[PDB]
Design a protein around this ligand. Sequence first.
Ligand SMILES: CC(=O)/N=c1/[nH]c(C)c(-c2ccc(Cl)c(S(=O)(=O)NCCO)c2)s1
Length: 839
Amino acid sequence: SEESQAFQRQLTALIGYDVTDVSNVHDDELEFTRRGLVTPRMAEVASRDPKLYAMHPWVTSKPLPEYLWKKIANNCIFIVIHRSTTSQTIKVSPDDTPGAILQSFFTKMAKDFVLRVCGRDEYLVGETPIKNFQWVRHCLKNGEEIHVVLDTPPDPALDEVRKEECDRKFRVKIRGIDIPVLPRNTDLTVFVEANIQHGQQVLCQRRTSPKPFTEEVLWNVWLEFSIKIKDLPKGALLNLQIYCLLYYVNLLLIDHRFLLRRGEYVLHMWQISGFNADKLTSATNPDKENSMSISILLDNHPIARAEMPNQLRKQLEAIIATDPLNPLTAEDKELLWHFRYESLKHPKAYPKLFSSVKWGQQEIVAKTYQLLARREVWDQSALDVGLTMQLLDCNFSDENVRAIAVQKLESLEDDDVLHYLLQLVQAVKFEPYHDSALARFLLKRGLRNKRIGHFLFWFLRSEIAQSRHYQQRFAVILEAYLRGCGTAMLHDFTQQVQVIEMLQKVTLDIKSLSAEKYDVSSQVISQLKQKLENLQNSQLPESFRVPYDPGLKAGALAIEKCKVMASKKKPLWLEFKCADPTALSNETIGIIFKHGDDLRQDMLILQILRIMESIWETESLDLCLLPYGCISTGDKIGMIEIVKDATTIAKIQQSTVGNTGFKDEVLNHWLKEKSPTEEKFQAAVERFVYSCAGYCVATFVLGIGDRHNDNIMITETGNLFHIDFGHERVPFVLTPDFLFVMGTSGKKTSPHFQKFQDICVKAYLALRHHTNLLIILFSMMLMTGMPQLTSKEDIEYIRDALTVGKNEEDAKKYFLDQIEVCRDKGWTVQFNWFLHLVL
Ligand SMILES: CC(=O)/N=c1/[nH]c(C)c(-c2ccc(Cl)c(S(=O)(=O)NCCO)c2)s1
């Protein structure tokens, strides 16, 4: 077809990669995966209810936390419905349905339709209490009145999807290596290391003889491995590495058709920088010109209970109780394996059990499959996301193991998917094959719910733009999604892509008008405005969805308010009009636009923050973190949400006291001067003690607590919040000025500080109840979000931070010391940031 080719060229520009391309291939897994994904796509497309799809009610089935019940002291809730300008308030009970409110309106007042929130593409529809809508719980928590317009359901037809119509030792022959341009050092020796890998576990290892490092090195050696051919498990990687460690590539021993991989290969390798997820990719380097290569030959068809004593059961259960980062001894492993059936009765044993498996042994693998045949206990246990994530990490390369984890995820309501989506997407980096239960799960869930669908797009596009290690895989997944999201969403994405391309192609030019002499002259700010007013007319779209808040529709630029800012990089501060006529307020949408940092680390941190909040919700705690919108759109560059009416703490202090200097009161004065009534001031000191506590606990746990005061902000209403997670010591930032607000000054105790301490201990202990989930997220963040990181140095930090294996009193004691360490030195580390600027 011809109207199918434009559509392909449409999808390419949306994706940022061309998936028809075959240049960087050596087999057909990608195309196979495109074809494979058609079925599950169409199964979810055919399945979804058009009506509920179009309106995508954002809904939860969690209870309602104690601290928001207190905010409805009457079993009634106030909703204000509108038409033109005609408006009326309605008495509603928490258990009322959108259905039970329409008649409480129509049958109540006379002189079909649906309830949409003012200023947003967000709806209150479907069989759910209003108390179980997200927009409603937000309105409460924020002290805000719910505002909603009456109009029609949006036409489901707008979401019309288009139309698609042996038994011997294994051997590998190393021929040679070659880099087109060598020049680097008195080149040491150089050898090839050939690992047979499965789940980061090396099953077998052979090397070449060491030879000189010229731009062409040879061997012609057959390397014989200890493993037999029938002993190879599906998912096994031939991992080929160059030491002198500087280069790596991987080739799957068994392909997507269960065939043993045979023949000649010329593989272009990746270079080490200066363990992590990049080291695992089946993708070869596409830069065939600059990159080191390797040549190999494969010639080698398809794939082929009683009662336990006492003290051992104790020993077993000790092992099972232990944390995800506890090393399993050989003794521990054999214990688990020999008593696998007894181990199978404990859903928590599963990770340690399945890493007690000798995957290099064919007959044991089989027994493990038989073992997985009786899933009774597993299938009936409640969802433990933490358990499930463990099975999706770099430690498991077996499809059956991985699929039981994907099975458990099915029972997640879309609310919870949204919480774990970034990390489920990053977990895709740990899949041996392009077609996985996990990729498909993301596809299904993505297409069933537009909100998920939106974030799935941006999450995948972030990686496609930024890493060659996985861009091909993620691109095939993105195409699968785009092919079913609907014409309405395709148009939307198109809008959004245009805008950010246009806007980034302005962040560049501007940044190069001063390298390090930051000082934004009139010559700079004016030409910025000239670009935008040029853009406004005949290129920049009418209205785009705010990528980090798909609810809000942004309209026209407000040129006058735009700027560059004092930052040592040069980020755009941009403000937009809302395109929604019904918008309750006339306030602008602020979006920062920043080039120079890798925003994916900021994404991973923010999202764990949201997780940490919901974790706290489970125990009726609120720490009012402000996890600001932040989306990585392209390479080294992406957008951020402007929190209105906030300023940096350092910037606050550089208004009263010189520049090099500090002083302790200025925070509290700044608060009193920006809050009108001394009550709204107390509402601010309130907000401060909670927000402060939260960022202290969260921050310590992730070991990102030692920050320079310019990296912490506060709102005009008391809410403190860390920013720019782009990358002697202090556990967190609790400085004298903070303490001054709490009614304390250098080594004493006060009622707000007594509270502060109290809420901290309570917040900490709460996270400790979810220890395992946090350990796995952290290490996955480390493996999929950074350069190189250590498998017991970087990660093993969080065991200690969360104080694994302690009684609550120890834990509380431990944390309260950290509070006191910050006390000792108060301004010490702070001052140092400026001292280093000369040492
Ligand atoms: C009014 C105001 O300053 N609002 C803001 N709110 C937020 C969350 C801001 C923010 C958040 C993150 C980042 Cl990364 C930045 S930034 O201006 O790009 N970086 C400055 C380095 O410290 C600014 S700026």
